[PDB]
Design an enzyme around this catalytic site. Structure first.
Site, PDB file in Angstrom:
ATOM      1  N   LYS A  82     -35.688 -12.192 -47.328  1.00  0.00           N
ATOM      2  CA  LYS A  82     -35.998 -10.901 -47.998  1.00  0.00           C
ATOM      3  C   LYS A  82     -36.170  -9.754 -47.000  1.00  0.00           C
ATOM      4  O   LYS A  82     -35.963  -8.652 -47.383  1.00  0.00           O
ATOM      5  CB  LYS A  82     -37.244 -11.024 -48.884  1.00  0.00           C
ATOM      6  CG  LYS A  82     -37.056 -11.836 -50.162  1.00  0.00           C
ATOM      7  CD  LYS A  82     -35.626 -11.775 -50.656  1.00  0.00           C
ATOM      8  CE  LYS A  82     -35.322 -12.357 -52.012  1.00  0.00           C
ATOM      9  NZ  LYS A  82     -35.638 -13.777 -51.999  1.00  0.00           N
TER      10      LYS A  82
ATOM     11  N   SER B 169     -37.301 -23.966 -51.380  1.00  0.00           N
ATOM     12  CA  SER B 169     -35.936 -23.564 -51.795  1.00  0.00           C
ATOM     13  C   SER B 169     -34.923 -24.036 -50.744  1.00  0.00           C
ATOM     14  O   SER B 169     -33.791 -24.275 -51.112  1.00  0.00           O
ATOM     15  CB  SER B 169     -35.834 -22.078 -52.022  1.00  0.00           C
ATOM     16  OG  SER B 169     -35.883 -21.373 -50.824  1.00  0.00           O
TER      17      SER B 169
HETATM   18 NA    NA Z   1     -32.269 -22.107 -51.807  1.00  0.00          NA
HETATM   19 NA    NA Z   2     -36.981 -21.886 -48.542  1.00  0.00          NA
HETATM   20 NA    NA Z   3     -38.944 -21.590 -51.400  1.00  0.00          NA
END
Ligand code: NA
Ligand code: NA
Ligand code: NA
Ligand code: NA
Ligand code: NA
Ligand code: NA
Ligand code: NA
Ligand code: NA
Ligand code: NA
Ligand code: NA
Lengths: 309, 309
Positions: free
Chosen positions: B41, B270
């Site tokens: 990000k 993730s």
């Molecule tokens: Na991912």
């Molecule tokens: Na991650």
């Molecule tokens: Na994550």
């Protein structure tokens, strides 16, 4: 290109110019929080393991044993996993964060007693290695020359390159002394420039200041994690230290908060100590036109249950 | 050289080859955890603010308003501080970590109601901006083209360069769709190579899979933070997605644990999802000799109070 394991990706960390510290941008910080395990220690975790391999002390089969308060345990622990070594770490049984992080990285944790603290766990580590010397290797951050060597080879040349040789002053809190020693050797001896090397220690445990002044060494408790070990370690080369700056626990914290809210830099508590010290040297006319580079050992999230928040 | 503020230091993240996933080293990971605010990000926080400045939507005086579950709030929050903007962030009033981190960065936090959750805070953000439209700017990660643009300009070219053009497959979990969109555009359109772009979504909320198959979109709860928003965002370009892979919450976590203990990579939840998905495509003969690059959005410490530990 592509690193064979996480250990080879250490360093190449960025220089960021400060806006609300120094004088016309004379204070630039090196973000060591941007490493495989998110500290300066990632460098010494990689190079202490590499060197022990190059000289047959560490072999496929052998098992890393070590005692850690924090960063070096996490560093040596990511290296162990990347290169395929079992590791055992002993610690003053603390920070639940750091416990959960270490078990997460596949470390066989051994907790000692609190009251005994850091020297408690060292003893315990030694016992585990005296139980079977042939299968255990203690790397010993505080005296292992591979610690300062990686900083002479990587952290110091990166500063030279990124500043185009205009670096005049380096400021580094001292834990092992590895960073200031290695960095200072690179620029003074390898690159031939006579910079001011500034060691930063807590005013609550000003053992380097006390030593160099021929005054009784009185260590003391503080809140600046990663510096102020309360003794002069073998990897601090006094001979290359031109100046020593002391910082109190309260200032270090506020400065770490200032770094976040005012500069948008996620720095650790020891990062607030180096920057407080650099800010003072930067607002002396004698350092006014000098380029001061500061080492920010770690990142903010490592400190979420600490006085920093 | 020296970055004028933390925003300019985004990216140049490393490629690390995996040892216990893929087939003869065909799976290499991109560690986006190594950024100013320690996520992918950081790239969109920097470029959404930059672009709003370049077109007079964001001005000295104006104030960032936005709603965030996590990473983009922290990113836009380090940028605000670095560049000298006041920011207000609304959130499902949660993660005490992320609350303490955000207040730490000088964010004026507004907590909404839990039961309403993510859309609860969006509404509240909008109200604050309808209270004084002339002083507030909502950057809108899910549809702002500046999100995919920075990945076309930075994350994608870095992959091209670091792989020497040998990259055959990119795997990216989809939250906003910014990373897979921007990366895919760089390599397919800017560099002219016809890679397989693979979007990764939770099997519990397989809305991209469901859409592309002409089946009723049924979103659902999962534990993979940062992906699986339960709708198709405007910054996911479906047109550039060659394949969609689904991963369950349990696998993603175990894979994130495997990344730490087996590879010494401190990856987020993730990151375990993308790698699970990449591992499956890597162990199909059809991808055997192909170079698969995977996006690891974040780092482990952001997840200390989560199911990952
Ligand atoms: Na991912
Ligand atoms: Na991650
Ligand atoms: Na994550
Ligand atoms: Na300055
Ligand atoms: Na320090
Ligand atoms: Na040092
Ligand atoms: Na620090
Ligand atoms: Na610290
Ligand atoms: Na592989
Ligand atoms: Na994406």
């Amino acid at each position: 290109a592509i690193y064979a394991d996480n250990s080879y990706s250490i360093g190449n960390t960025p220089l960021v110019r400060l806006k609300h510290f120094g004088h016309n941008g004379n204070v630039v910080v090196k973000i060591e929080g941007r490493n495989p395990s998110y500290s300066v220690k990632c460098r010494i975790g990689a190079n202490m393991v590499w060197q022990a391999e190059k000289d047959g002390t560490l072999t496929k089969g052998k098992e890393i044993v070590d005692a850690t308060s924090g960063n070096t345990g996490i560093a040596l622990a990511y290296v162990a996993a990347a290169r395929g070594y079992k590791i055992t770490l002993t610690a003053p049984e603390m920070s639940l964060e750091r416990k959960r992080l270490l078990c997460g990285l596949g470390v066989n944790l051994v907790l000692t007693e609190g009251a005994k603290g850091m020297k408690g766990a060292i003893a315990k580590a030694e016992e585990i290695v005296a139980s079977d010397p042939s299968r255990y290797v203690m790397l010993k951050q505080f005296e292992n020359p591979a610690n300062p060597q990686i900083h002479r080879e990587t952290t110091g040349p990166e500063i030279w390159k990124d500043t185009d040789g205009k670096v005049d002053v380096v400021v580094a809190g001292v834990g092992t002394g590895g960073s200031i020693t290695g960095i200072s050797r690179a620029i003074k001896l390898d690159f031939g420039k006579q910079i001011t090397s500034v060691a930063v220690e807590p005013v609550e445990s000003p053992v380097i200041s006390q030593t160099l002044a021929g005054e009784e060494v009185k260590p003391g408790p503080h809140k600046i994690q990663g510096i102020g070990a309360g003794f002069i370690p073998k990897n601090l080369d006094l001979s290359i230290i031109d100046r020593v700056e002391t910082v109190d626990s309260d200032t270090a914290l506020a400065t770490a908060r200032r770094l976040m809210a005012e500069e948008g830099i996620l720095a650790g508590i020891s990062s607030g100590a180096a920057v407080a010290a650099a800010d003072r040297l930067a607002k002396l006319p004698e350092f006014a036109d000098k380029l001061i580079v500061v080492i920010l050992p770690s990142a903010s999230e490592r400190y979420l249950s600490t006085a920093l928040f």
